[PDB]
C-alpha cells in the first residue's frame, strides 16, 4: 500500500483505489496503473522533475529502503500478477530488486523528490509507475 500526497492530490495505484478515490476522481489510467483523487487537506510531498535513474525505494515486504538504479519510463510487457493479467504497462521503470504485490505504493525518491510508486514485481525486478511527467500535480 501507499500514496503520494502533493497539493490537493492523492496518487495511488489504480488497482488499490478506494470508493472515496473514485468518488473524488481527478485522473486515472489503467495502462499506467495510476489514479489521482482530490483531497481536502494540502499534502507536502514534492514530485521530482528530472530524468534521474538512481534513487531509493521503500519495500514494505522487507521493511527496508533500497538504493536502486532504474530504467527510463517505457511500455513494457508485465507477466501476470495477483492484481493484473499479463499485459503492457506504460510509463513503467524497472530496477533489480524485491517487489511483492503488497509493496505496491512504496515511494521511489531521488534528490529532486518523489519519482514514482511501486507498481510491478517478479523475476527479481521491481517496476515503478513514473509520475514525473504529470506536471499538473504541481498546480491548481
Helix (H, G, I), strand (E, B) or coil at 4: strand
Judge whether 59 is annotated as a binding position.
no
CA 22 to the chain's CA centroid: 18
Catalytic residues: 15, 33, 104
Residues forming contacts to Zn ion in the complex (CB under 5 A) are 48, 50, 52, 110, 112
Least separation in angstroms between CB 115 and Zn ion: 6
Q: What DSSP assignment string belongs to 54-91?
A: EEEEEETTTTEEEEEE---SEEEEE---SSS-SEEEEE
Least separation in angstroms between CB 25 and Zn ion: 28
* β-bridge partners, 122: 125
Least separation in angstroms between CB 120 and Zn ion: 21
Judge whether 112 is annotated as a binding position.
yes
Annotated binding site for Zn(2+): 50, 52, 110, 112
Amino acid at each position: 500500500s501507499g500514496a503520494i500526497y502533493v497539493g490537493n492530490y492523492r496518487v495511488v495505484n489504480r488497482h488499490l483505489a478506494t470508493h472515496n478515490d473514485w468518488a473524488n476522481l481527478v485522473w486515472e489510467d489503467s495502462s499506467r496503473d495510476l489514479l489521482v483523487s482530490s483531497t481536502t487537506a494540502q499534502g507536502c510531498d514534492t514530485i521530482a522533475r528530472c530524468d534521474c535513474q538512481t534513487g531509493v525505494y521503500y519495500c514494505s515486504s522487507r521493511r527496508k529502503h533500497y538504493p536502486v538504479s532504474f530504467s527510463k519510463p517505457s511500455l513494457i510487457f508485465v507477466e501476470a500478477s495477483e492484481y493484473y493479467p499479463a499485459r503492457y504497462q506504460s510509463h513503467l521503470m524497472l530496477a533489480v530488486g524485491h517487489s511483492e504485490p503488497g509493496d505496491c505504493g512504496g515511494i521511489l525518491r531521488c534528490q529532486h523528490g518523489v519519482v514514482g510508486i511501486v507498481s510491478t514485481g517478479g523475476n527479481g525486478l521491481v517496476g515503478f509507475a513514473d509520475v514525473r511527467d504529470l506536471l499538473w500535480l504541481d498546480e491548481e
